[PDB]
Write a protein that binds this ligand. Structure first.
Ligand SMILES: [Zn+2]
Ligand SMILES: [Zn+2]
Lengths: 536, 813
């Protein structure tokens, strides 16, 4: 533990002798200097560092897998990894593992681009002021990628469970009366009649005399599994039974993707048991800060949480009563600055609690009436991958706390080996409005909604003419791994908590249902939820 | 309550949908009354008879017409159940399509402000205990004299500021105790306040002010005097005149009221919502408070509205209330949607629709602009009342069109207000101008995107018809932008202009379509070199001359005076040539055919001298302060030879004329020979140095002027202030509108329709590698266009110092 400074020239012989000869690692001058600094700091007289170098190189070859170790990033990374493995074994550090280094929240703009090579591959894709503008090919392939994902899901589930094959729509032309099973995107033709769209083509469908699976919502833009007899007399597909694709368990998708290292899995599993007492509190929807009654109720809720602050306090969308837009007036209407005043008022009612706002990440989720998204939509369901609340309106709130995250509407949480997805949207209303009728209670409707969302595998299985989506930011809506926990926030659906296909779906509902400021509590360790209604 | 108007209809809900305060001005004095109002819903039973009959009988089909995109279901407490009777069985709560109008609103819409309880004394006493339900009470009554005669006031104006001076001032009709060296300035304003009160005592005849105005200089250090002292003073005044005073409240933010003051003054309340130098503001406001009381009385007399109407663009609320009344007289469902700017189209208004989105974010007004030199006399005709005249004369399958019946209702109402204002009618004209301005106001309580789009198309087509009419009259158009139109009269002689112009205006007014369209000629141009609105010069009335060339701002500071001087030289040469042609006599070929010969040789020699001077001093320091290209919001061009840019601009403004193209091309070739540049070289071609960034249909909050503000081209003084007036514009409003346009551009790029790159057939399917004609898909809005627009926005924000716009740009990436 004796500190010492050792110059790179004397350490150079032994360093190379092991890094280069034993394993084949090239060490640069700057990297050699950094390694000499590390060895001098964490050991004296620089004699018994052979095991340290061996551990460094073996970790580097096991994880990083490249050359030129002296990049100031590879060396630091391997030293840190050595630190955590020594910590979990319980030197430079001998403390306990902290979940903060394994807890992260992923925005819609910072995920990994995963485009599926149509045959069999899930590839990885990963520049100026207008560097966020999607390209045209992104719009072209937006639905193709979704179809390929659904087709892979069907090829894994249906054939191994039910064994009719899937015939591409282009294969129905010459056939006169044979039976086919089509997987296509239900949509309305420009001529005004329903049809299914496939990468190979499209075909009109005669929806009369169809028996649909009643446990699903059927809407244009959702991908269905129709079955019927093609007719070449009028080029129509007389569908008999149409149902949504079967869902998949998350664990099944993980071995196909094959994404985790063993040490990271062990550490995450260990802190899963160690961190038993962590509480996630999910507030209600439509926190209308403009309303004085809701403002007073929020004070009582924050006071109650101040006694025992939770791990995360998630705030739902539509923070203001009226949609924000450019207002022509000489008063303090000023829909921009009035938002700033509302957040400043929130800061007053939030900085008053010293016990709260400390050791509590505060994630904020935007809604239909938030800045930069309500400017054009005027409070309607506009572009789905909503950008976070602008930082220009969060000066006081961010100054008051120390860990506050402003995230996208379809945000992702990486608290542990499990993934949590938060989504604020009135899915039930749109589903009911755009559900198509077949010419041929509340808990049942909630189950229908959850089943439709999970079977579709997409957060919004809707057409581009009903819910515009940023073309490149579409993977942020795809439920390819089917995350374990999903906060399907809503304002037109009754509060519920359901589990399906290994996924826990929780809907806190509106903040004020009749007279109570409802909010939800989530315990990741026990996977148990409970609502906390508080009277006004 | 007998023929008594409620002064304020404040929402005394107490959780009851229908219970609210009614301060009806009874014959003796105002008294607090409670009402009861069922929540009417316009859910017409479309092809489905539902016999459920939960609480109230439901009318079948409502005998009305819905909104393409007399009280059915008259419940009383929807709180009973939010889920209500959701069935989705052929329009039985399948689509709401009802009314969101809460209490305090349906009362004004249906019941007149003045009302009389058409019941006996026993029924009156029975209704005293619980309230006066509108179902069996409160018939609408005539409003010949709706207001009162002598009403006490409780003036409590307050103008806070962050500098550190508190304006928690209160005024009394007789107490005169204004509690805040002010006596001298107060008397100074009193010196003409004798005349002001004489006007009040001859036109208002409502209240009088005591002459002993005592000013109490008290410093409201903290809340103890900021709020508690004000509350105790106002409760002392309240117990002084018991429910016998009208609160004239002025406060930028109303939360001070609703804290404790509002329920301290439940009596009739009005929300005006409007260091030594700032002292005069208080005395001016207190001594002018006696002027608009008569205006409010007149407004409430004409418009059937109580005194609870807010003064923030009160014309918008008046128009909403009157339009709702005229629409309720007809069997048309309303689209109120008080909570949100979007129309109350049931529930279909909350989801994205491509057509609705397009009609919303499309306000670009076509401009007809012809560039050239016009030796003929051209008139700067300025149109006015285009929207009003358009809706009035619009009388003279389509899913994108507004309802024809609602438009007819609007036309009839506008005709009524118009004829009224024509005869002496103050409020009538106020409301016509206000309607012109509201149609496009999302804050309106009846705003409809379809209606605004319909009005926009009607205005576009009316302007096109006006242009065609002027062309037929024998005058070509060189500019038309919905606020002004420039016509090229064929009369060469400037003397023969007045009679021709008057004949033209009369002939335009003869057409029924433009009868209400008022036109006035602003300026006469004997000569005009027109490139754009912001790049023009010429002789104006024949003796004044103007040189407004935005191209000059993009030249190096040394050459800006050279361009300015040579513009005057060119204009004078053109004038001399025109005079010579007119003297000799008294487009293929006009009066100008050799105007370049006057200054060709001096210009060439000056350019040679300037080129030698530049070659001497281009690289040497201490001169780079002159040979520097200015940075402007529209700057997008890299300049290597600033003198070449100067000669390019001069040659372009000379090439504007169509007749003298050849003699100016020869001059340009000779000029370019100096730089050893070819005549048709790419670098020698003139490209506009400035881009454009227009905020369409920007509205001036004072004079109601609808103009397209351009930020990359207009001078800074012409964007922060209006045109017809000279009042300033809010920085926050400009930044908000710029952000709105930026988000509209982003959304329009994201929701664009792809089309084939070879046959241009629009893409119809969702999964398709390419067009069936073997052509790759391409967008109708290229990505490069949006990138350029974003760069323009960033340049404007960085130059003008728009902080919120910079925050938006940063938040994009
Ligand atoms: Zn103005
Ligand atoms: Zn094509």
């Amino acid at each position: 533990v004796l500190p010492v400074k050792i110059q790179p020239p004397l350490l150079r012989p032994l360093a190379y002798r092991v890094l280069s000869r034993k394993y084949g690692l090239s060490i640069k001058s700057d990297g050699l200097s950094a390694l000499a600094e590390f060895v001098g700091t964490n050991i004296g007289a620089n004699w018994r560092q052979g095991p340290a170098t061996i551990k460094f190189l073996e970790q580097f070859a096991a994880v990083w897998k490249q050359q030129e170790r002296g990049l100031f990033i590879d060396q630091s990374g391997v030293k840190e990894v050595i630190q955590e493995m020594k910590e979990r074994e319980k030197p430079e550090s001998s403390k306990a593992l902290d979940w903060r280094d394994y807890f992260k929240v992923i925005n819609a703009s910072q995920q990994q681009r995963f485009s599926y090579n149509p045959h069999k591959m899930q590839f990885i894709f990963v520049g100026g002021i207008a560097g966020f503008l999607p390209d045209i090919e992104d719009k072209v392939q937006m639905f193709l990628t979704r179809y390929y994902l659904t087709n892979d899901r069907v090829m894994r589930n249906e054939n191994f469970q039910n064994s009719m094959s899937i015939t591409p729509i282009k294969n129905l032309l010459g056939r006169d009366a044979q039976n086919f099973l089509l997987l296509g995107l239900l949509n309305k033709n420009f001529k005004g009649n329903w049809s299914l769209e496939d990468p190979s083509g499209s075909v009109e469908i005669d929806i009369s005399q169809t028996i649909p699976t009643q446990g699903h919502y059927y809407v244009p833009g959702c991908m269905v599994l129709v079955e019927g007899i093609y007719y070449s007399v009028g080029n129509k597909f007389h569908v008999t039974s149409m149902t949504l694709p079967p869902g998949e368990r998350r664990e099944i998708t993980l071995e196909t993707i094959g994404n985790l290292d063993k040490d990271l899995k062990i550490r995450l599993h260990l802190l899963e048991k160690e961190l038993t007492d962590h509480k996630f509190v999910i507030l209600g929807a439509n926190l209308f800060l403009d309303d004085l009654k809701i403002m007073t109720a929020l004070s009582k809720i924050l006071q109650k949480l101040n006694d025992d602050p939770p791990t995360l306090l998630i705030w739902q969308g539509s923070f203001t009563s009226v949609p924000v837009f450019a207002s022509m007036s000489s008063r303090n209407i000023s829909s921009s600055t009035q938002f700033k005043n509302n957040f400043d008022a929130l800061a007053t009612l939030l900085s008053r609690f010293d016990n709260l706002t400390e050791n509590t990440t505060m994630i904020f989720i935007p809604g239909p009436n938030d800045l930069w998204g309500s400017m054009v939509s005027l409070g309607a369901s506009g572009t789905l991958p909503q950008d976070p609340i602008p930082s220009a309106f969060t000066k006081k709130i961010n100054k008051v706390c120390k860990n506050v995250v402003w995230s996208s509407n379809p945000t992702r949480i990486a608290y542990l080996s499990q993934e949590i997805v938060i989504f604020r949207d009135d899915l039930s209303g749109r589903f009911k409005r755009h559900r198509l009728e077949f010419p041929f209670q509340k808990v049942q409707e909630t189950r229908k909604l959850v089943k439709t969302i999970l079977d579709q595998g997409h957060l919004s299985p809707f057409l581009d003419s009903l819910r515009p989506i940023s073309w490149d930011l579409d993977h942020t809506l795809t439920l390819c791994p089917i995350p374990s926990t999903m906060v399907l926030c809503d304002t037109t659906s009754a509060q519920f908590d359901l589990t399906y296909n290994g996924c826990k779906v929780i809907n806190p509902g509106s903040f004020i249902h009749n007279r109570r400021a409802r909010y939800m509590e989530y315990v990741p360790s026990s996977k148990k939820t409970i609502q906390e209604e508080i009277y006004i | 309550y007998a023929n008594s108007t409620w002064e304020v209809l404040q929402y005394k809900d107490s959780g009851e949908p229908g219970v609210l305060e009614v301060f009806v001005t009874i014959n003796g004095k105002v008294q607090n009354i409670t009402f009861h109002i069922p929540k009417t819903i316009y859910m017409k039973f479309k092809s489905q008879t539902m016999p459920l009959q939960k609480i109230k009988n439901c009318l079948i089909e409502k005998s009305s017409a819905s909104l393409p995109n007399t009280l059915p279901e008259s419940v009383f407490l929807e709180e009973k159940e939010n889920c209500t009777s959701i069935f989705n069985d052929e329009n039985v709560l399948g689509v709401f399509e009802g009314t969101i109008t809460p209490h305090q609103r349906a009362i004004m819409d249906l019941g007149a402000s003045v009302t009389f309880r058409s019941k006996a004394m026993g029924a009156l006493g029975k209704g005293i205990q619980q309230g006066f339900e509108m179902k069996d009470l409160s018939m609408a009554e005539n409003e010949r004299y709706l207001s009162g005669f002598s009403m006490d006031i409780g003036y409590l104006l307050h103008f806070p500021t962050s500098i550190g001076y508190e304006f928690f001032s209160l005024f009394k009709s007789w107490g005169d105790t204004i509690t805040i060296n002010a006596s001298s300035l107060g008397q100074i304003y009193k010196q003409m306040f004798e005349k002001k009160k004489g006007k009040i005592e001859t036109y208002s005849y409502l209240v009088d002010i005591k002459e002993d105005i005592n000013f109490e200089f008290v410093y409201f250090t903290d809340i103890s005097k900021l709020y508690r002292r004000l509350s105790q003073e106002t409760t002392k005044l309240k117990e002084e005149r018991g429910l016998q005073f009208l609160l004239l409240l002025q406060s930028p933010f109303i939360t001070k009221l609703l804290g404790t003051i509002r329920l301290l003054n439940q009596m009739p309340i009005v929300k005006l919502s409007l260091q030594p130098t700032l002292l005069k503001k208080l005395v001016n406001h207190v001594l002018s408070s006696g002027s608009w009381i008569s205006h409010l009385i007149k407004l409430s007399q004409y418009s059937n509205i109580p005194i609870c109407n807010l003064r923030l663009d009160s014309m918008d609320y008046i128009i909403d209330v009157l339009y709702a009344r005229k629409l309720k007289k007809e069997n048309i469902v309303l689209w109120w949607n008080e909570k949100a700017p979007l129309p109350d189209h049931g529930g279909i208004q909350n989801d994205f629709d491509l057509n609705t989105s397009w009609i919303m974010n499309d306000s670009e007004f076509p401009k007809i602009n012809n560039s050239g030199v016009y030796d003929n006399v051209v008139l700067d005709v300025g149109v006015d009342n285009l929207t009003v005249n358009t809706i009035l004369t619009s009388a003279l399958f389509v899913h994108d069109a507004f309802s024809n019946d609602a438009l007819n209702v609007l036309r009839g109402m506008l005709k009524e207000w118009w004829d009224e204002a024509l005869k002496e009618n103050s409020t009538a004209d106020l409301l016509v101008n206000s309607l012109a301005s509201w149609v496009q106001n999302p804050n309106a309580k009846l705003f409809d995107g379809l209606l605004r789009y319909h009005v926009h198309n009607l205005t576009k087509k009316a302007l096109l018809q006006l242009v065609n009419e002027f062309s037929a009259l024998g005058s070509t158009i060189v500019y038309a932008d919905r606020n002004q139109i420039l016509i090229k009269t064929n009369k060469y002689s400037p003397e023969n202009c007045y009679a021709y112009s008057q004949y033209m205006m009369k002939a335009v007014r003869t057409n029924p379509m433009f009868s209400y369209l008022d036109l006035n000629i602003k300026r006469y141009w004997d000569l005009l070199i027109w490139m754009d609105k912001f790049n023009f010069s010429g002789l104006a009335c024949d003796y004044t001359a103007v040189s407004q060339w935005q191209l000059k701002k993009f030249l190096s500071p040394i050459y800006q005076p050279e361009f300015e001087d040579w513009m005057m030289i060119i204009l004078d040469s053109m004038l001399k040539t025109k005079q010579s042609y007119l003297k000799l006599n008294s487009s293929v070929e006009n009066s100008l055919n050799g105007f370049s010969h006057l200054f060709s040789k001096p210009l060439m020699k000056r350019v040679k001298k300037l080129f030698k001077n530049q070659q001497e001093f281009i690289l040497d320091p201490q001169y780079e302060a002159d040979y520097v290209i200015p940075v402007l919001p529209g700057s997008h061009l890299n300049v290597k030879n600033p003198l070449l840019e100067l000669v390019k601009s001069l040659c372009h403004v000379m090439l504007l004329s169509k007749s003298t193209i050849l003699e100016i091309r020869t001059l340009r070739k000779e000029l370019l020979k100096i730089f050893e540049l070819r005549e048709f070289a790419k670098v020698a071609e003139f490209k506009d140095p400035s881009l454009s960034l227009v905020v369409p249909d920007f509205l001036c909050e004072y004079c109601f002027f609808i103009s397209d503000i351009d930020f990359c081209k207009a001078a800074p003084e012409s964007i922060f202030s209006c045109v017809r007036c000279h009042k300033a514009f809010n920085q926050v409003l400009l930044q908000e509108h710029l952000i709105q346009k930026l988000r509209s551009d982003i959304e329009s790029y994201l929701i664009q329709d792809l089309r084939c790159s070879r046959c241009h057939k629009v893409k119809r399917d969702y999964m398709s590698a390419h067009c069936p004609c073997a052509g790759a898909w391409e967008g109708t809005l290229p990505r490069e266009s949006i990138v350029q627009k974003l760069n323009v926005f960033k340049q404007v924000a960085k130059y003008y110092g728009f902080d919120i716009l910079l925050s938006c740009i940063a938040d994009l990436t």
